[PDB]
Structure 1
Amino acid sequence: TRPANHRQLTFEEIAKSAKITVNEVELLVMKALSVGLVKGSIDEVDKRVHMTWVQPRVLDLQQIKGMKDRLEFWCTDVKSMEMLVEHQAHDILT
């Protein structure tokens, strides 16, 4: 659910969403790393974990519109940045 902006969460939030105490969630997430459904790091002193890789799930015909649109302006960055190389690098190769 969390975007690629942060995807970083706290043990208070985990304690809320799984309503389990503070001294069990670390044993949960070490098990999650052992299974390897998730890949990330654990900080203890700021009580936050830097989740990086997650198990890929399935999705409906609605998220493919989002991946379509994320694909779409990713095209025009290649167009726009490539056009500088074409136009400015023109005298180097005819």
Structure 2
Amino acid sequence: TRPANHRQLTFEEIAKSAKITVNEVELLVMKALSVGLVKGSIDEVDKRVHMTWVQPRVLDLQQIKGMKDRLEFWCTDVKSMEMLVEHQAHDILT
């Protein structure tokens, strides 16, 4: 859901969505880490779960559209500040 801007998920959100109790979420996330559909980690001083995730799936063409807009913002940032570098050091580039 959230595209790794704040992927530090709180434990209560798992206990709300999966409607499982608080004490089972650690065995729940160590299971999915064991199977290998996720490669995150667990903190417990905040009881928040960090997520580095590598199991992708189908993304339903209306969300290819939002994937296009990410790629274009990514596109124009590459092109613009390439032009800033070329115009800045044009005299010593040659």
Q: TM-score scaled by structure 2?
A: 0.92
The CA deviation at 1:83 is: 0.5
Question: How many matched pairs?
Answer: 94
Taking the TM superposition and a 5 Å limit, the aligned residue runs for 1:9-48 are: 9-48=9-48
Q: Which runs of 5 or more residues in structure 2 are unaligned?
A: none
CA RMSD of aligned residues (A): 1.1
Deviating above 3 A after TM superposition, structure 1's stretches of 4 or more consecutive aligned residues are: none
TM superposition score normalised by structure 1: 0.92
* Structure 2 Cα separation of the partners of residues 60 and 14 of structure 1: 24
Give the whole-Å Cα distance in 1 for the aligned partners of 2:84 and 2:11.
Answer: 47
1:73 & 1:44 partners in 2: Cα distance?
36
Aligned to 1:38, the other structure's residue is in SS state coil
Supply the distance in 1 between the matched residues of 2:23 and 2:91 (Cα, whole angstroms): 66
CA shift digits 1:27-76 (9 cap, x unpaired): 01001101110111101121101111141011111111111111112111
The CA deviation at 1:18 is: 1.0
Identity of aligned pairs, percent?
A: 100
Rounded Cα–Cα distance in structure 2 between residues aligned with 1:20 and 1:86: 56
Q: Which has the higher helix share?
A: 2
Measured after TM superposition, the shift of residue 14 of structure 1 is: 0.8
